Amino acid sequence: MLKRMYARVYGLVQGVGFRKFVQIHAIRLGIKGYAKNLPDGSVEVVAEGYEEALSKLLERIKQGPPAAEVEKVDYSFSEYKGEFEDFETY
Ligand SMILES: [Cl-]
Ligand SMILES: [Cl-]
Ligand SMILES: [Cl-]
Ligand code: NA
Fold it and tell me: Within 13 A of 73's CA, how many CA atoms are on the CB side?
């Protein structure tokens, strides 16, 4: 039940506290990895932990904070690799 999740988030998702929103919910859920601003205005999330935790995080990612407007989320799941010690933003 440990897994890795990839998500990329499109819309009004930069400059609206989106990464900090992902982070707080990741910390609440025990999830490690990062939320990364991409050069096309989208956001990438790379997250590791228990699959049900990741699923809860994905629910939050699809909404974002009040200031965001999430248009689309592409996501996938793969084998847990155990690569992270905490949840960061950059
Ligand atoms: Cl942010
Ligand atoms: Cl982990
Ligand atoms: Cl992978
Ligand atoms: Na994508």
Answer: 19
| CATH class as words, domain 1-90 | alpha beta
Ligand nearest to the CA of 5: 3
Ligand 4: centre distance to CA 66 (Å): 22
The Cα–Cα gap between 36 and 49 comes to 18
31 Cα–ligand 1 center, Å: 18
* Nearby residues for ligand 3 (ion, Cβ within 5 Å): 78
Ligand of minimum distance to the alpha carbon of 86: 2
Is 56 exposed, middle or buried (CB count within 10 Å of its CB: 0-12, 13-18, 19+)?
Answer: middle
At what resolution in Å was this solved?
1.7
Give the domain ranges of the chain.
Answer: 1-90
Active site residues: 19, 37
Which technique was used to obtain these atomic coordinates? X-ray
